[PDB]
Ligand SMILES: C#CCO[C@@H]1[C@@H](C)[C@H](OC(=O)NCCCCCNC(=N)NC(=O)NC)[C@@H](C)C(=O)O[C@H](CC)[C@@](C)(O)[C@@H]2OC(C)(C)O[C@H]([C@@H]2C)[C@H](C)C[C@@]1(C)O
């Protein structure tokens with residue numbers, strides 16, 4: 001019954017704000033007016049991005065911003081709510097550029113969560129900005145707080161939540177209450193920075209938006225899909241860092257949760273969240289990319305998948321060889337490594353030498369250019385069927401994407417997502433989810449339902465034996481066990497009754 005959330009980022013550069021116009025593509029490619037009423041109805045949230053934290057340790061616009069043109073841009077987004085009484089215009093603080101470990105504003109993020117008084121100032125600033133510009137909610141995109149800072153982050157969010165709840169009451173907004181989200185890690189290396197405290201991080205949120213994309217890139221040895229739903233056994237696998245997180249668990253508990261190596265997939269990140277107690281599936285939102293990542297230098301045989309490559313990882317792009325054939329936007333943006341889906345459609349339609357290919361394990365498409373050795377990972381409306389089905393089966397909160405500007409002119413990607421969740425006549429009950437590798441991990445938050453004979457006192461149980469006792473199905477870790485399940489270290493909680 002509950003509508004799935006559909007959360008799209010709206011990004012716009014300061015200079016485009018400062019020269020805002022709806023009538024010249026060359027200055028603003030993606031003005032607000034491109035978000036039609038139909039698109040507005042298909043969205044539950046728009047995340048206006050990006051604001052930052054300044055050296056005053058407050059939430060702030062880029063100090064180069066024209067305040068009047070900014071309010072005006074924001075007012076145009078809030079005006080969209082006239083077409084959709086569920087729609088919220090959030091704003092996001094952070095992003096990669098401002099907030100990564102070597103990002104320009106990084107110390108501000110660290111310092112703003114550091115002390116109770118810093119947090120009180122920061123939290124106040126966030127809600128002050130929300131109220132002052134007419135936003136509906138706050139999204140923090142810090143990529144990423146690191147173990148010492150995690151406690152502060154958690155307290156900062158708790159403090160923002162309280163203040164948002166005050167505001168909701170002040171404005172009689174119980175029908176559309178002010179909301180708080182974060183953009184969360186979508187792979188285990190970064191996730192591990194705050195995994196042990198995942199329940200505390202999620203508890204103040206309406207949603208945690210998993211950045212389950214960019215899981216592959218020019219920083220890798222080997223080309224791969226950036227947003228594989230499930231694993232392909234032919235592709236690379238990675239070390240599971242979560243098994244070194246400070247969890248306090250036993251060896252068997254770690255082993256059952258954190259297989260290693262493992263396939264770095266949408267399904268993995270999702271399950272890694274669900275294995276944690278107190279992380280409810282309804283709060284977990286699957287992120288998807290509206291952009292492809294391109295590699296060159298690929299020597300193929302398998303469509304350019306899982307090949308070595310020569311794609312530079314340096315930022316900015318280190319020369320003017322714009323080798324992504326047919327990508328006009330790459331030229332404008334001086335970087336051939338990222339193409340919007342809009343662009344990718346034109347590349348594929350034109351006479352440029354690409355084949356669209358499909359990996360039936362990952363359920364994701366990819367472009368291959370056999371003549372030049374190019375590979376592109378991206379998502380389309382076919383891969384979204386499988387993902388939307390996954391979102392329904394696993395009872396997730398919804399879907400998030402980066403970003404709106406990269407949908408095609410008709411908004412076919414957004415339309416596809418809306419359709420798979422909400423169209424009466426769309427049926428995915430026969431859609432085959434394939435035999436690609438699932439993430440098997442089991443943890444306290446996602447115990448399966450099981451049966452077994454009652455535990456009996458006096459019986460000697462061999463290794464592997466399953467009994468039921470006091471709610472749960474337990475399994476001996478070795479033999480021969482006579483102790484009651486749960487009372488010493490010999491029994492492993494493996495499932496739940498009922
Ligand atoms: C998001 C993101 C990455 O920031 C980009 C930026 C870094 C671009 O990278 C990019 O687009 N990558 C696509 C992959 C996305 C997947 C990763 N997603 C995330 N990590 N987070 C996420 O999804 N959060 C919800 C890059 C190509 C660029 O233009 O940099 C230019 C210089 C070339 C810039 C640094 O000057 C940049 O200029 C403009 C174009 C004005 O954009 C400014 C920033 C100052 C933004 C602050 C940075 C912003 C948004 O363009």
Ligand SMILES: C#CCO[C@@H]1[C@@H](C)[C@H](OC(=O)NCCCCCNC(=N)NC(=O)NC)[C@@H](C)C(=O)O[C@H](CC)[C@@](C)(O)[C@@H]2OC(C)(C)O[C@H]([C@@H]2C)[C@H](C)C[C@@]1(C)O
Pocket residue numbers: 100101102187189214215216219220221238313
């Ligand atoms: C290596 C290398 C050179 O640069 C590295 C960096 C580029 C890493 O490359 C690397 O290890 N390459 C060797 C082969 C992959 C094998 C494992 N593979 C993985 N761990 N894969 C994975 O997690 N996939 C999502 C890369 C994994 C990364 O984290 O990029 C992030 C963006 C996602 C980054 C570019 O923002 C990066 O983030 C952090 C981690 C904060 O580090 C910053 C830099 C800003 C350093 C400047 C770059 C420094 C040193 O981490």
